[PDB]
Ligand binder design. Structure first.
Ligand code: 3PE
Ligand code: 3PE
Ligand code: PLC
Ligand code: PLC
Ligand code: PLC
Ligand code: SF4
Ligand code: SF4
Lengths: 145, 118, 115, 88, 160, 70, 192, 233, 126, 48
């Protein structure tokens, strides 16, 4: 948790002597550093086959047109079995009980657009948690819950 | 002192006048409407000080502050004077005369060499 | 959103006759702004010269035949009108637009290098 | 095929007339490229030996799929061309 | 969050949402993006795992120089990587990431060749500048600067 | 700009009272306050009508969408 | 079970308390009228803003004094292209044309032939430093570390012609910067 | 009042043998491929007349329609509450000269509500117009102008279509395959004319073509199928 | 019959999302517009059109859930498609589509058939 | 050992939440000071 941190826990140039106590009396926030890095620590020493293959097994490119689309409702599926063959005529003459299981899900209810990530669930947070602006500021903070 | 301030105000509005119209004449109705308005507030502040000493002589005004400095009684006026002092000179934050991000160099975009120095 | 000055919707015209009348008005629009093009771009050629060049431009390609290619030629010529009238092309491009431009015998081309 | 599409492609006048495009086959697909210029295709720069050029179509090659597809394109643009039949 | 990628699911951070849709709100969101980004940097430093830094497939990555000059298989892939390049299997893709400006995405078509066929780049600054007319209408000339600034325009990205 | 001319003549006409604030005594002070209260009504009038505001009427108009079922 | 029955999702579910509360009116402000007026009239936040700026006036500036001092550099720094050389004196480069192929900006021009001794070397090797992007594929492509980028950056020239580096100019730098390139390589050996 | 540590002197773990897992990334899309196939079938169910075909690559869904059927499908994909694709992120194109309709106009849509993206792909020729999606999305006003400028595609119904990426008075549409990468002309300054003038192209060094030593062999094959068994014959 | 249904208000309390004011009397107005949707299907869209079946699959489902719940919060939570103000928008713009979809006759056969080579990418059939 | 890895304990937490504590006396005190400064000032002017 990123609470306030004293000056002597930040790798920066500090104050030595009575000037430290002068600084802590004049500066508005005594736990802020000057920002100059620590010369004594910061950058002190300078910098001086098939089992493991997947590209060849990339998912294939298969296109589903009106001809093949009609075949799933009539013949069924390759898991649960049941030229130009137009779909529009098939929808005009076919059993709605085929529709309520194949062409639709959960009793004809329309299929909500598939989420790119299901677990994107948000919750509204509060000031004492995220340490951000108080309530009057015109933003709100969301989290992943 | 106040009269000579007015002449410089009229001196500035000449800068953005008739020298084509790209950026100087954009900041001349803007300029004139600024250092006109604050010249009211600056003038009133001066007179209120002169009212306290009943004199229009700067030496009398200076010599009459022996036992008190008008920063103590007239602290609001000093802020108001300085705010008006900034705006009259067109210094920032009241610096839309030469609005660098808006009017390139403001009214001095045409000026170069000696006209700029003066 | 607010469209700019001298804008027209891009429409696929499905008539031979309507395109004829659209072009005719367009040619007048160029001639109406003949004085402006001289004063806007500070062209060295007088107003009559620009109309002469505009006429040479319009006379040049009046014999096209394909309607699907008629709309494309009307669409882009509209852009040329819109770019020029709105004063968008720089001064140099208009000066060089009118500053562009008989062959030589085989001996002349043989000697220097031909192409 | 009958369309004068050259007035919409914006290509210079020299492509229609003074340039020749070869439709060849290097082993399953066909390609189009323009034959080299008579002079000025490649002259040695006298400063650093760079291979200078005035031909702007030297670096252009179009990968096609079928022969008739390439011929359709060449007629569509109004391009002069010839076809090189590969040896069997 | 919508499409996690590159060890963003592992870390935790809070997104910021405004309420008024003006420049001051977008400022607060951008300032919050400072601290939330600094929050992840602590997590990335702490949670750093060991191991390799690139895929150990010589066909899509150069082999180490200690091994290029020792192993005949290593030198061949070094020679082949830098002259012909690796070939991308055919397909098409549109991957969008949270760029600092916004949604930046590339549309890439692979023609089975070592060179991409089509590379369209979605620049977040491109679309925002289009909405300048909708946003700036009715404001004053000084407000034009404020609107441009809050759009975070970088015209190298706009005119890609 | 036009309203600067009145208010500037008001301020610049208070000069006589500055150098004579003593001798005129209370009588001048009561006259001086009246000379302002008359000009305050001018100040009050411009305050109410919002004459100084630049105003934004040419744009920033919105409406509520309403279904018109038939 | 999901909300597909109602054509909704758990995604479409806004969090509890998503909707805004009622906005305050003038009677619901914590700071009294006098308290707000004093902050407003006396410029409380501006004066605080001034003080914090004055804090930085008593801090050490970050400025360094070029050219008397330089900023830090790393052993991986990509600067002036340079052609290296063996200790025995023979050129490291054997004219792959790996150089001419990788170069994204096509700034490398190589022409080679059999030397007199027969060992494969190149007689032309030109870099158009005005065309180069200092990408770094020079250094990575070499199987003999013949072309490397020195940590130098101060070589600006009056005439652009001086920015076309032929072989001799590249070889001159390779000798002139050899000891420095030793610092760079021997400090970056483990990570390659 | 305590001294700061030195991080270089902190104790560190020692790591030896590495076991980096090597498994097909396509496994994490096993459900994603399954979800999207139904949704495309659903759209074809709701639009038998317009949805010619569709295909799903990993977590991406593509809808192919004719130019006539473009605005109709995009309106359905915007308003229909099952698929609320309110934002049109990208309007792109590409050139494939072999086919009669060489161009391939793309439409990437974003659904903030349902958290998904779709791709409407409608072909276009050098002369066949495409209806503008401005009446649905005003955000394509600048994405279409880029497509017209770089391809010449004629967009039907654009409120104002013109050049947005090329120079004023530029000739030709660059992103075509027949357009040379170096262009036809380049500019310079001519002192006598006292202006910057266009001139025919001249290269001191021509663009060397290194594609000649390309691959002559096959690189990638069919691959491994991952189609969910519910979408097979 | 001359009626007026309030789609979105132009004043009042904000609803988090900018430019989306709080609807004064949403719950019956949602019920009215939801009911008017089912009337529009019965007049324009044929029976076999799966778009018609897909509208009722959630219009009846949601509209029934709205009536039982008398708290505005509970209407959103169980339907799970955002705020109440947004739920008005979803119902309204879906109503217009029923008018437009019937005009298009999108229940018919494929109007324009693609050519042979159109949907093949780089020679290999998709 | 032969790489860059964070320490076993990691590092101490960093400060990242907003930390802007206020300063100065309450506005009433500043207001009261302004009155006294005026109240004392007009006593000195009046004496003069
Ligand atoms: C350079 C020379 C110096 C110039 C500056 C001089 C500095 C001193 C300034 C003196 C004049 C300032 C007057 C301040 C005293 C009155 C202020 C006040 O009481 O507030 C106004 C008050 C509002 O009531 P309120 O505090 O809002 O109660 C509800 C709280 N939620 O409203 C009220 O109900 C009482 C108002 C009293 C009216 C007579 C005063
Ligand atoms: C109101 C409070 C009254 C102010 C105090 C006046 C006073 O006490 O008299 C001081 C002085 C005359 O005093 P004197 O009788 O001559 O000598 C006494 C020696 N212990 O009186 C004088 O000589 C000068 C008169 C003093 C005027 C003080 C003005 C105060 C104004 C405060 C404004 C506050 C704004 C809010
Ligand atoms: C508010 C700041 C006042 C200020 O700057 O005061 C500065 C102070 C007090 O001087 P003073 O009483 O304000 O005026 C001066 C009145 N003499 C002329 C009688 C001294 O100077 C010192 O004695 C230090
Ligand atoms: C009796 C008491 C006497 C006090 C005399 C002094 C008064 C001064 C002005 C107070 C009112 C004011 O600064 O107002 C602020 C005004 C107008 O703000 P507004 O339009 O009302 O918006 C605020 C709406 N609120 C009420 C909801 C918050 O704009 C400004 O930000 C002006 C900024 C001026 C900066 C000048 C810097 C100069 C620094 C000088 C020292 C280094
Ligand atoms: C001799 C004086 C000269 C200057 C006169 C004007 C000063 C400004 C204060 C008047 C307005 C007011 O009332 O400010 C009040 C405000 C806000 O306080 P709050 O939010 O209620 O505090 C919260 C709750 N506490 C009280 C528990 C903390 O305080 C300030 O932030 C004061 C700013 C600090 C520095 C000011 C001086 C910096 C300039 C350098 C001069 C030394
Ligand atoms: S550094 Fe890169 S771009 Fe520059 S010359 Fe070398 S390979 Fe080419
Ligand atoms: S990679 Fe090295 S050896 Fe090969 S051509 Fe380049 S510099 Fe010469």
């Amino acid at each position: 948790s990123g609470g306030p941190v004293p000056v002597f826990k930040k790798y920066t140039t500090g104050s030595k002597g009575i000037w430290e106590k002068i600084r802590q009396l004049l500066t508005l926030v005594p736990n802020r550093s000057t920002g100059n890095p620590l010369v004594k620590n910061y950058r002190v020493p300078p910098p001086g086959y098939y089992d493991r293959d997947h590209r060849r097994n990339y998912p294939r490119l298969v296109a589903f047109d009106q001809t093949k689309v009609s075949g799933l409702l009539t013949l069924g599926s390759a898991q649960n079995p049941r030229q130009s063959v137009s779909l529009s005529s098939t929808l005009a003459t076919i059993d709605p009980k085929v529709v309520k299981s194949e062409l639709l899900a959960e009793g004809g209810s329309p299929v909500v657009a598939p989420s790119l990530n299901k677990k994107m669930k948000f919750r509204l947070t509060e000031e004492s948690e995220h340490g951000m602006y108080p309530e009057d500021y015109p933003i709100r903070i969301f989290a992943q819950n | 002192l106040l009269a000579s301030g007015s002449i410089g105000v009229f001196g500035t509005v000449i800068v953005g006048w008739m020298s084509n119209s790209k950026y100087t004449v954009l900041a001349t109705v803007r300029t004139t409407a600024q250092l006109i308005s604050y010249e009211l507030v600056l003038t009133t502040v001066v007179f209120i000080i002169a009212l306290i000493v009943s004199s229009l002589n700067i030496n009398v005004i200076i010599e009459s502050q022996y036992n008190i400095w008008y920063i103590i009684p007239f602290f609001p006026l000093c802020l108001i004077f300085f705010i008006s002092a900034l705006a009259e000179t067109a210094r920032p934050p009241f610096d839309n005369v030469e609005a660098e991000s808006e009017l390139v160099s403001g009214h001095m975009t045409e000026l170069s060499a000696s006209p700029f120095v003066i | 959103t607010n469209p700019t000055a001298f804008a027209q919707t891009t429409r696929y015209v499905k008539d031979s006759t309507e395109m004829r009348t659209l072009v005719l008005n367009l040619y007048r629009r160029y001639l109406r702004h003949s004085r402006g093009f001289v004063n806007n771009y500070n062209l060295d050629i007088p107003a009559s010269q620009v109309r002469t060049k505009i006429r040479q431009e319009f006379e040049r390609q009046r014999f096209v035949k394909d309607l699907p290619l008629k709309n494309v030629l009307y669409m882009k010529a509209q852009m040329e009108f819109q770019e020029l009238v709105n004063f968008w092309k720089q001064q140099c491009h208009v000066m060089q637009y009118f500053e562009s431009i008989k062959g030589d015998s085989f001996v002349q081309k043989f000697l220097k290098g031909a192409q | 095929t009958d369309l004068a599409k050259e007035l919409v492609s914006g290509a210079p006048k020299e492509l229609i007339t003074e340039r020749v495009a070869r439709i060849y086959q290097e082993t399953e697909t066909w390609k189009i490229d323009w034959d080299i210029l008579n002079k000025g295709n490649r002259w040695e720069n006298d400063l650093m030996g760079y291979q200078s050029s005035s031909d702007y179509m030297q670096g252009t090659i179009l990968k096609f799929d079928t022969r008739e597809g390439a011929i359709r394109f060449a007629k569509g643009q109004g391009w002069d061309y010839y076809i090189q039949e590969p040896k069997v | 969050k919508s499409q996690p990628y590159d060890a963003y699911d592992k870390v935790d951070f809070d997104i910021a949402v405004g309420t008024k849709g003006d420049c001051y709100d977008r400022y607060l969101i951008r300032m919050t993006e400072f601290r939330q980004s600094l929050r992840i940097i602590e997590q990335c430093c702490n949670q750093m795992p060991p191991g390799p830094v690139k895929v150990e497939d010589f066909k899509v990555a150069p082999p180490p120089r200690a091994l290029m000059k020792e192993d005949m298989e290593a030198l061949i892939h070094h020679f082949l990587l830098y002259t012909k390049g690796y070939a991308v299997p055919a397909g098409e893709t549109y991957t969008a990431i949270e760029a600092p400006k916004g949604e930046m995405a590339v549309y890439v078509v692979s023609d089975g060749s070592e060179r991409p066929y089509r590379c369209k780049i979605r620049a977040p600054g491109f679309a925002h500048l289009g909405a300048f007319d909708h946003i700036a209408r009715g404001h004053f000339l000084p407000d034009a600067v404020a609107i441009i600034g809050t759009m975070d325009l970088v015209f190298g990205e706009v005119d890609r | 700009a036009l309203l600067f001319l009145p208010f500037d003549l008001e301020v610049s006409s208070m000069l006589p009272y500055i150098v004579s604030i003593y001798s005129v005594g209370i009588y001048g002070l009561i006259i001086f306050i009246l000379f302002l209260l008359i000009l305050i009504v001018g100040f009050i009038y411009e305050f109410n009508t919002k004459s100084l505001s630049i105003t934004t009427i040419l744009h920033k108009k919105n409406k509520a969408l309403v279904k018109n079922l038939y | 079970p999901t909300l597909a029955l109602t054509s909704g999702s758990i995604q479409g579910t806004h969090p509890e308390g998503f909707r805004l509360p009622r906005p305050k009116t003038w009677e619901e402000s914590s700071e009294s009228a006098l308290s707000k007026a004093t902050k407003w009239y006396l410029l409380s936040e501006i004066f605080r803003g001034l003080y914090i700026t004055l804090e930085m006036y008593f801090r050490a500036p970050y400025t360094i004094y070029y050219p008397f001092e330089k900023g830090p550099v790393s052993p991986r720094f990509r600067g002036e292209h340079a052609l290296r050389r063996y200790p025995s004196g023979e050129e490291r480069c054997i004219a792959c044309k790996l150089c001419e192929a990788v170069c994204p900006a096509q700034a490398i021009t190589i022409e080679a032939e059999e030397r007199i001794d027969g060992s494969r070397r190149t007689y032309k090797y030109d870099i158009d430093m005005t065309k180069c992007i200092y990408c770094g594929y020079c250094q990575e492509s070499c199987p003999v570390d013949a072309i490397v980028e020195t940590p130098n950056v101060e070589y600006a020239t009056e005439t652009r012609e001086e920015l076309l580096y032929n072989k001799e100019k590249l070889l001159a730098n390779g000798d002139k910067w050899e000891q420095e390139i030793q610092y760079a390589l021997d400090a970056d050996a483990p990570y390659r | 009042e305590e001294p700061l540590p030195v991080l270089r002197d902190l104790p560190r773990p020692e790591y030896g043998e590495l076991h980096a897992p090597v498994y097909n990334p396509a496994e994490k899309y096993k459900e994603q491929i399954e979800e999207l196939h139904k949704f495309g079938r659903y759209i074809m169910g709701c639009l038998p007349k317009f949805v010619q075909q569709f295909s799903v690559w990993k977590d991406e869904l593509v809808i192919y329609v004719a130019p006539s059927a473009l605005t109709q499908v995009a309106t359905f994909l915007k308003d229909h509450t099952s698929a609320q694709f309110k934002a049109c992120m990208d309007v792109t194109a590409a050139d494939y000269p072999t086919r009669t309709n060489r161009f391939d106009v793309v439409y990437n849509l974003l659904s903030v509500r349902h958290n998904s993206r779709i791709r409407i792909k409608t072909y276009a020729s050098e002369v066949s117009p495409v209806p503008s999606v401005v009446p649905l999305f005003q955000g394509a006003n600048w994405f279409e102008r880029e497509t017209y400028d770089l391809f010449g595609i004629f967009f039907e119904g654009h409120p104002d279509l013109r050049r947005i990426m090329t120079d004023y008075g530029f000739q030709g549409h660059p992103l075509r395959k027949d357009f040379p990468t170096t262009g036809y002309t380049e500019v310079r300054y001519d002192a006598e004319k006292r202006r910057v003038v266009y001139e025919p192209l001249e290269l001191t060094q021509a663009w060397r073509n290194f594609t000649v030593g390309s691959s002559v062999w096959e690189q990638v094959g069919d691959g491994k199928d991952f189609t969910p068994e519910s979408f097979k014959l | 019959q001359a009626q007026e249904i309030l789609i979105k208000a132009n004043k009042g309390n904000p609803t988090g999302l900018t430019g989306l004011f709080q609807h004064p009397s949403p719950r019956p107005t949602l019920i009215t517009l939801y009911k008017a949707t089912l009337k529009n299907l019965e007049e324009k869209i044929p029976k076999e059109s799966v778009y018609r079946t897909a509208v009722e699959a959630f219009t009846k489902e949601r509209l029934s859930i709205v009536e039982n719940n008398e708290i505005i919060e509970d209407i959103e939570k169980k339907i799970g498609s955002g705020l109440v103000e947004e739920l008005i928008v979803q119902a309204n713009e879906e109503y217009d589509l029923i008018d437009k979809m019937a005009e298009w006759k999108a229940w018919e056969e494929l109007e324009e058939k693609p050519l042979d080579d159109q949907w093949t990418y780089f020679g290999k059939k998709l | 050992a032969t790489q860059d890895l964070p320490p076993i304990s990691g590092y101490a937490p960093i400060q990242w939440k907003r930390n802007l504590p206020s300063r100065g006396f309450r506005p009433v005190i500043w207001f009261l000071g302004l009155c006294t400064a005026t109240g004392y000032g007009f006593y000195q002017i009046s004496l003069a």
